[PDB]
Design a protein around this ligand. Structure first.
Ligand SMILES: Cc1cc2c(cc1C)N(C(=O)CC(C)C)c1c([nH]c(=O)[nH]c1=O)N2C[C@H](O)[C@H](O)[C@H](O)COP(=O)(O)OP(=O)(O)OC[C@H]1O[C@@H](n2cnc3c(N)ncnc32)[C@H](O)[C@@H]1O
Length: 381
């Protein structure tokens, strides 16, 4: 009995306009009618706006590393007109052993060197030369990846979204998917002003992907959102930290990285929580500050910014890009974990190809990706 617009027909409905939905929609948009439906008033209010903005190849499971490695080409060399400035800026990563665990440090070095030939094993003195506020007594060695980079996430995200629009796709904010139903051979999504129909439902809803499956009556994946907080603080007078690498402890207990003229810190946490608009917890912030003040000579007065976001995982830690078993037309773009920005070019390209029943592009295959390792089917026997 309330008015709705006449239904809108498309080829692919993408639920969520974060990095996942934007990247998938970008690669779909040249091929068919894309409509991206986003709940919030802006597309990057949730995890995509909350990351450390870093590109780290030796990070996550083997699949993650392959997706990250395969994304670099696009980030370094995107198509003419995608963006106005470079997407990456140089930011090596230094993983420091604060634990005195030389067996683990050597494992991570060998693992990383196999992927990144330029990876180096540092002694404690070398680590302390690179970040001179380190407490030498607390440092037992490090790895150093000269190939790490910071990502201009807003430029990347907006570039994907703009590409959709330039291909006559629609990016609709304030369009929460409220109901999802298979109707007359298509998925039909009800938003508050009208409905949308397409043969393909692309579920790119971040921490809410299982909620979207719930609307649709599709078996969920078991996605677990995990809170990570971060904060920005001023360096002490006299500390020119602008060119420091990203500094991470070997057991991922904290990290520290320059952000412009400030410092980004984090306790690098992964506290399991439900999907929601997550806020930083005081204990998270206090813990990250404590660990930084223990590992270094820095003193942290009071943060300029604090926030938290959700890093969402399935049980094996790998991302998901594939059609749901026994749910025609329902395509998962999920479980981005701690890696959704740095994997987005490969994930966007792979997911769009698979949605369109195309083989994965060679360059992706050559990084050792295939359909099966991306599929949600692997989570079950
Ligand atoms: C927090 C957090 C996260 C990272 C790092 C730090 C912190 C502190 N971070 C590191 O700590 C690295 C170390 C090495 C330093 C680094 C990260 N990722 C990197 O690649 N690089 C990093 O440096 N991450 C993970 C990335 O942040 C993370 O992997 C990536 O951002 C995930 O992107 P999605 O696209 O999957 O998720 P969205 O939430 O954006 O978008 C979903 C949208 O869906 C909508 N939506 C939902 N429901 C509906 C309905 N009903 N209807 C309609 N619409 C609906 C909803 O409103 C959203 O807008």
């Amino acid at each position: 009995h309330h008015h709705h617009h006449h239904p809108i027909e498309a080829d692919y409905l993408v639920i969520g306009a974060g990095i996942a939905g934007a990247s998938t929609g970008y690669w779909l948009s040249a091929h068919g009618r894309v409509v991206v439906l986003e709940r919030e008033a802006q597309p990057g209010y949730h995890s995509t706006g909350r990351s450390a903005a870093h590109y780290t190849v030796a990070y996550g499971t083997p699949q993650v590393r392959a997706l990250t490695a395969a994304s670099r080409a696009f980030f370094d060399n995107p198509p003419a007109g995608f963006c106005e400035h470079p997407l990456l800026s140089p930011r090596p990563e230094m993983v420091v052993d604060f634990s005195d665990d030389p067996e683990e440090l050597r494992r991570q070095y060998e693992s990383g060197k196999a992927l990144v030939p330029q990876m180096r094993l540092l002694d404690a003195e070398q680590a302390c030369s690179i970040v001179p506020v380190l407490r030498r007594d607390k440092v037992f060695g490090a790895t150093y990846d000269p190939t790490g980079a910071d990502i201009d996430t807003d430029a990347l995200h907006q570039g994907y979204l703009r590409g959709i629009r330039r291909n006559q796709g629609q990016v609709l904010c304030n369009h929460e998917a409220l109901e999802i139903r298979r109707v007359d051979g298509a998925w039909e999504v009800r938003c508050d002003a009208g409905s949308y129909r397409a043969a393909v439902l692309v579920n790119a809803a971040g921490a809410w992907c299982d909620a979207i499956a719930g609307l649709a009556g599709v078996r969920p994946l078991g996605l677990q959102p995990k809170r990570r907080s971060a904060f920005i603080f001023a360096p002490p007078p006299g500390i020119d930290c602008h060119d420091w690498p990203m500094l991470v402890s070997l057991d991922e207990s904290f990290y520290l990285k320059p952000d412009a003229g400030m410092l980004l810190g984090s306790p690098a946490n992964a506290d399991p929580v439900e999907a929601h608009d997550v806020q930083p917890e005081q204990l998270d912030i206090a813990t990250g500050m404590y660990l930084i003040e223990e590992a270094t000579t820095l003193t942290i007065r009071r943060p300029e910014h604090t926030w938290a976001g959700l890093r969402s995982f399935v049980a094996d830690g790998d991302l998901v890009a594939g059609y749901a078993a026994n749910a025609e037309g329902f395509f998962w773009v999920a479980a981005q974990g701690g890696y959704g920005i740095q994997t987005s070019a490969a994930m966007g390209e792979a997911s769009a190809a698979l949605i369109r029943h195309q083989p994965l592009p060679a360059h992706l295959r050559e990084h050792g990706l295939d359909e099966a390792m991306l599929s949600p089917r692997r989570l079950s026997p």
